[PDB]
């Protein structure tokens, strides 16, 4: 993607504001974050399965694979947020969670917005065209790409089993790395006047 001037401005504005917010009142520890990815069956039309992973600095919260019958809708994403939140509630056994996710249509439509309001989630400002500011993408997915190269799955189950081994392979500090990098990435974005860095 070739950033326009308005897109760089939005990146710069959000970056600068988030760095100051965290300095004023640190909130990284309250972030829950996610993203969707298509996992190809052949990693050397083509079969693929979509995964959604949810996590915080404390660790893996929830992940799910899009199954036959299911549609990628705001209705589905709302049900996923409810399930994720139940798992977070078990795992956290005090300030409310803050969701960082991109502007994919289901993320920003009803009834996703109402679900977030009902469960007590703030949504973090996120600028368009910025996977370099989305930790699931710049951290988890980067390491997952490394892991999948260059495997071959036969079915959806083998693809799931490889994602599982990937997740279970990670050390306890792996997630914290991705989250904590946000400060440095916001700053690099400010340093480059809202461009990529």
């Amino acid at each position: 993607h070739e950033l326009t001037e308005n897109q760089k401005n939005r990146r710069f504005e959000v970056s600068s504001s988030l760095i100051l917010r965290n300095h004023n009142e640190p909130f990284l520890d309250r972030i829950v974050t996610c993203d969707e990815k298509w996992i190809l069956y052949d990693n050397r039309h083509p079969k693929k399965v979509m995964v959604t992973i949810w996590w915080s600095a404390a660790g893996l919260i929830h992940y799910s694979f899009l199954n036959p019958g299911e549609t990628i809708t705001s209705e589905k994403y709302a049900q996923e947020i409810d399930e994720m939140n139940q798992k977070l509630q078990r795992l956290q056994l005090r300030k409310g969670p803050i969701l960082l996710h991109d502007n994919a249509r289901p993320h920003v439509a009803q009834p996703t917005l109402q679900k977030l309001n009902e469960l007590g989630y703030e949504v973090l400002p996120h600028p368009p065209y910025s996977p370099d500011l989305l930790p699931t993408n710049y951290h988890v997915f980067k390491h997952l790409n490394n892991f999948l190269q260059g495997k071959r799955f036969h079915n959806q189950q083998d693809a799931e089993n490889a994602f599982q081994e990937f997740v279970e392979s990670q050390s306890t500090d792996f997630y914290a790395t991705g989250i904590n990098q946000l400060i440095s990435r916001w700053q690099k974005c400010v340093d480059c006047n809202g461009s990529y860095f």
């Binding site: 404390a58 660790g59 795992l91 997630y175």
Partner: peptide, 4 residues
């Protein structure tokens, strides 16, 4: 800390 991190998840149990």
């Amino acid at each position: 800390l991190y998840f149990a």
